[PDB]
Amino acid sequence: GLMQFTLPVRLCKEIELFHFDIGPFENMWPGIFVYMVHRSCGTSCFELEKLCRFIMSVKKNYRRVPYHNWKHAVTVAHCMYAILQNNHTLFTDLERKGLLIACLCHDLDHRGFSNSYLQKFDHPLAALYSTSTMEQHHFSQTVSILQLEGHNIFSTLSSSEYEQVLEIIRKAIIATDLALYFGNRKQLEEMYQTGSLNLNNQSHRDRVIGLMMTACDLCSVTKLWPVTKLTANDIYAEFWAEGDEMKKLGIQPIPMMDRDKKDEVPQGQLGFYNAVAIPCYTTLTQILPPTEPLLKACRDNLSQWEKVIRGEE
Ligand SMILES: Cc1cc(C)n(CCNC(=O)Nc2ccnn2-c2ccccc2)n1
Ligand SMILES: [Mg+2]
Ligand SMILES: [Zn+2]
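== cAMP and cAMP-inhibited cGMP 3',5'-cyclic phosphodiesterase 10A ==
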């Protein structure tokens, strides 16, 4: 119990900030995650032996893909840590426990292909899960790893608390399907504006936790410009591979995924910021005022992409 994780001074301070980058040293990422669980949840939330075994099994079931990798998992978990630490009294013990684990597990066994590509390929997972194909697989993989011997980090919870936490994790992981984000934010927008939003209404909490998951999942657009710009290369490396694979199935990919149309990228980032990212962090800031730094950072980056187009960089 008396064993803490401590980070070097620069990390100890910068990790509290939304725009923190976890760095290129992979062997430090597990310690950073445990540090965040201990401060967000407590030193007692998990058996340290079981947590460490869970963390390393989760790492092993992420693939060596350009973007949807172990680094993304830890990055999305850090953004959730930042939201929880800035909204101390709004979330229950089970929710803080659940959401950090959901973020770490949210893209388990990702291959770097969209739900659309699985459907057009006719992948077995598309036959097994007709909607949110990859996300149902990510939750399936999470349950698998929790059921390995020595890996059940929730064993000390009651039967009902256990079922509650697995239901928080399931909903959280399904919400990372961007196809579900558009309707979810629209509903939250109306509820906030007509004043019907009620955080004691479980169906309302679910929607708010969903938007947090979208905000955390997209947080690469809220980093300082040099981090956002370099992460964009990894996300587009996956999109171009998928577009190559669409061409192999005899389907011309949308321009965003066509590597012959790299010129169109800056304008494609504009569309993504205006259609997805700005609306996402605007609604999140209305519902959770202390997440405003994510909206500010997103706006700064929209303006940096505007400069790329105007040939100023
Ligand atoms: C860095 C960093 C991290 C992330 C996630 N991006 C965004 C990369 N673009 C992207 O994901 N596009 C996308 C996927 C599905 N729909 N759309 C889409 C929606 C509206 C307009 C244009 C495109 N950059
Ligand atoms: Mg995903
Ligand atoms: Zn993700």
